[PDB]
């Protein structure tokens, strides 16, 4: 009786939200950006090839200096690369080799990683002893660790396969805030540029917008038909793009609280592993299972170019803070740095 | 045309590669086994016989180092992290023979043996393990023999029309799992009957792993 009545009220609230979103859908993003000229064909060459990983690479993250990057592979090695020279700055042996994510601290003093061991390990890069050591192991998730992102040297947000995201205080090693509400495995998260909000995509085909300080879900974004594997904030923080296993990328708006554009092609029938934006946000770069990285026009949903330089699934990619280059990691154990030429 | 600091920076990188290449050779000569099974199916017993989120166990037998990964604690979707084990030497699958007349505690309608068959079918026919051999263990042999005297095997398999003896009932169950093999060309299944007091469980794995090593060597050398 009471349970039946309550679940009927949830359907009414969902219908109310759907009608509200449809009410403000006066125009389409395609119509708005029809007049602007296309970006043309985007041709990028492999400037650098980072060799040394001997197994599948699962994650990479640029440092804020746009020169150093950290990559994680399931050969049990975290490697820090000097992208300008391809020199290896550090090689961090992982206690657990089943790593799925890695993060570079914005200060550059720390890196983080974690996988099927359900632990987010923090590594100090600037020690008086001259070696990288584990400074913290963040335990508490009951599923695999899918993504992690530093807010600063003391705070990091992790998403897990136990359907929850958490905000951690690194100094005390405890999660100050727990973000619950996903009914499936959360596969990725992206921090807003001001680091006051973050979005997460899960395997329930939904994306939730979370308030970091308050600790509750502000908005929920649906529309995908399968698990969301990748998510990335727009450079101004008012939008984000997701990549799912249904071979589609969608651009959701925070303020309009609904999807604006879908980025898919008929030839593409494989899942999407990673997504990122260019510095201006005009280009959306997405990694795919078909060994390729497709460059999309974010505004016009046109495939601007293709990065085809890997012999296995492109598992991760990232764009520098200055927008100078894009790195792609892949299951073929190589990382490649791409940029165009005049 | 590099400065004195950059020359040491490049020299440092070569020092790192000498250690990464060294570890790659060591990690390629060790055996990585993925351990699967059902609840109370003897999967935990095998670890005790061959002594967070994932439990990893190491043991060396006859100059061969084995890495056995137990993923019983992962309650999330299997399909997300299953590809992380693409490339394991072999898969050890534990099935409880005695759990043929029992049912799942939660489902209360699905037979416990049929649950193992569905799990085996999802792993044997999995795309990531197309050419991965399976070392199928059928544990609880003694308990299965006692229960088959009172409880007929027809309850689990209605199509079974054989003698009510272990020598014929167990062989029928073994063929049922092997019949689930959707690719009888690229892989073989090594079926073994263990027990709570057996001591040849590790020996079977070593011989089964050796045949997998030989098969990979033949593929590399071009004979196969």
């Amino acid at each position: 009786s009471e349970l039946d009545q309550l679940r009927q009220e949830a359907e009414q609230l969902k219908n109310q939200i759907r009608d509200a979103r449809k009410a403000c859908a006066d125009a389409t993003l395609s119509q708005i950006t029809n007049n602007i000229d296309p970006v043309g064909r985007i041709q990028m060459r492999t400037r650098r090839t980072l060799r040394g990983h001997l197994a599948k690479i699962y994650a990479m993250h640029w440092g804020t200096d746009s020169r150093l990057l950290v990559s994680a592979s399931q050969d049990g090695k975290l490697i820090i690369w000097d992208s300008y020279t391809t020199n290896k700055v550090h090689a961090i042996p992982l206690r657990s080799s089943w790593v799925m994510t890695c993060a570079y601290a914005p200060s550059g003093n720390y890196v983080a990683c974690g996988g099927l061991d359900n632990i987010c390990s923090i590594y100090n890069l600037k020690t008086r002893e001259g070696n990288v050591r584990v400074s913290r192991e963040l335990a508490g998730h009951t599923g695999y660790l899918s993504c992690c992102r530093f807010l600063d040297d003391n705070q990091i947000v992790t998403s897990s396969g136990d359907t929850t995201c958490a905000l951690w205080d690194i100094e005390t090693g405890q999660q100050t805030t727990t973000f619950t509400g996903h009914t499936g495995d959360v596969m990725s998260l992206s921090l807003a540029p001001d680091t006051r909000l973050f979005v997460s995509g899960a395997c329930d085909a939904s994306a939730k917008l979370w308030d970091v300080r308050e600790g509750m879900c502000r908005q929920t974004f649906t529309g995908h038909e399968s698990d969301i594997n990748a998510i990335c904030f727009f450079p101004n923080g008012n939008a984000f793009a997701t990549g799912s296993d249904d071979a589609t990328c969608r651009l959701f708006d925070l303020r309009a609280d609904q999807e604006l554009m879908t980025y898919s092609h008929d030839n593409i029938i494989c899942g999407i592993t990673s997504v990122s934006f260019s510095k201006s946000g005009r280009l959306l770069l997405a990694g795919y299972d078909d060994f390729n990285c497709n460059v999309w026009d974010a505004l016009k949903a046109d495939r601007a170019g293709v990065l085809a330089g890997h012999d296995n699934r492109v598992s991760c990619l990232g764009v520098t803070d200055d927008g100078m280059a894009v790195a792609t990691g892949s299951w073929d154990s190589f990382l490649k740095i791409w940029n165009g030429s005049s | 045309t590099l400065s004195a600091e950059d020359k040491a920076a490049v020299e440092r990188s070569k020092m790192i590669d000498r250690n990464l290449r060294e570890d790659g050779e060591k990690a390629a000569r060790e055996v990585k086994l993925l351990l699967l099974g059902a609840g109370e199916s003897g999967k935990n017993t095998i670890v005790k016989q061959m002594k967070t989120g994932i439990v990893e166990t190491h043991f060396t037998f006859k100059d061969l180092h084995f890495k056995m990964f137990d993923v019983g604690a992962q309650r999330s979707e299997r399909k997300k992290w299953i590809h992380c084990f693409e490339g394991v030497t072999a898969i050890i699958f534990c099935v409880a023979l005695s759990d043929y007349d029992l049912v799942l505690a939660e489902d209360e309608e699905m037979n416990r043996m049929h649950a193992s068959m569905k799990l085996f079918d999802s792993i044997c026919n999995n795309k990531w393990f197309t050419d991965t051999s399976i070392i199928l263990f059928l544990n609880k042999k003694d308990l299965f023999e006692e229960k088959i005297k009172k409880s007929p095997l027809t309850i689990c398999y209605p199509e079974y029309a054989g003698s009510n003896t272990y020598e014929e009932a167990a062989a029928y169950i073994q063929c049922q799992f092997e019949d689930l093999n959707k690719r009888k060309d690229t892989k073989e299944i090594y079926t073994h009957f263990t027990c709570s007091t057996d001591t040849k469980n590790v020996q079977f794995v070593f011989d089964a792993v050796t045949d997998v090593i030989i098969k990979n060597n033949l593929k590399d050398c071009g004979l196969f």
């Epitope: 150093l68 020199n87 550090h90 002893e129 070696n131 | 400065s3 004195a4 600091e5 040491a8 020299e11």
Partner: single-chain antibody
């Protein structure tokens, strides 16, 4: 804690041989390149030798090449300097210096206490030998180089060290602008091309000492004469 203890120094006869050891504790010795730097009495700093991490690269100063041998024992974390045919010119305090080289590292950051030995090329110039100073006042120290220390990669390989009376040298500024870890922010390094300035805002009692500018563009590493601050 990070420690570097040198031993083996003492009074030796001319033409003799002596073996200097530098034992390292509290840090990953095998990850750091190691230098020996000496300072003649009432003179400036003088670089002696360098051995890289992994012992693959070895450099010597011209004045000692062929007579001195530098070696390391990574399992024992000991640095060695085998000396032969010792001359009266070799009378100096020999310092053990660690330096690690990767992008963003701070070479020459830690120096040993030194051992005393008594026997019975880019030019770095610090013309101003002494500067009378008062606490709380801003001081600038000038250094000059015969060659431009700015490399084509954007780095300017100039280092600043402070040797307080009775103490080992300490790194202040590495690559002409960066401030070493544990150094107060009042120190600032400014330069261009061949002319460099070290600015010390709000001078304190601890800052009193001799200041050396070193070039790291190429070997041999050469030091300036040094500028002393006195009250």
């Amino acid at each position: 804690d990070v420690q570097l203890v040198e031993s083996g120094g003492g009074l030796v006869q001319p033409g003799g041989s002596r073996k200097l050891s530098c034992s390292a504790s509290g840090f990953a010795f095998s990850s750091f390149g190691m230098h020996w730097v000496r300072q003649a009495p009432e003179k400036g700093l003088e670089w002696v030798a360098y051995i890289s991490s992994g012992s693959g690269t070895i450099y010597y100063a011209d004045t000692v090449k062929g007579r001195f041998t530098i070696s390391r024992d990574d399992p024992k974390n000991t640095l060695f300097l085998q000396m032969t045919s010792l001359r009266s010119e070799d009378t100096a305090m020999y310092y053990c210096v660690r330096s690690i080289y990767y992008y963003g590292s701070s070479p020459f950051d830690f120096w040993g206490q030194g051992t005393t030995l008594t026997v019975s090329d880019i030019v770095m110039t610090q013309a101003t030998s002494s500067v009378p100073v008062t606490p709380g006042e801003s001081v600038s120290i000038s250094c000059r180089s015969s060659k431009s220390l700015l490399h084509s990669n954007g780095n300017t390989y100039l280092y600043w060290f402070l040797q307080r009376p009775g103490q080992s040298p300490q790194l202040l500024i590495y690559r002409m602008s960066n401030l070493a870890s544990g150094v107060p922010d009042r120190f600032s390094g400014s330069g261009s091309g061949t002319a460099f300035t070290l600015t010390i805002s709000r001078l304190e009692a601890e800052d009193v000492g001799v200041y050396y500018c070193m070039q790291h563009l190429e070997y041999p590493l050469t030091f300036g004469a040094g500028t002393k601050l006195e009250l």
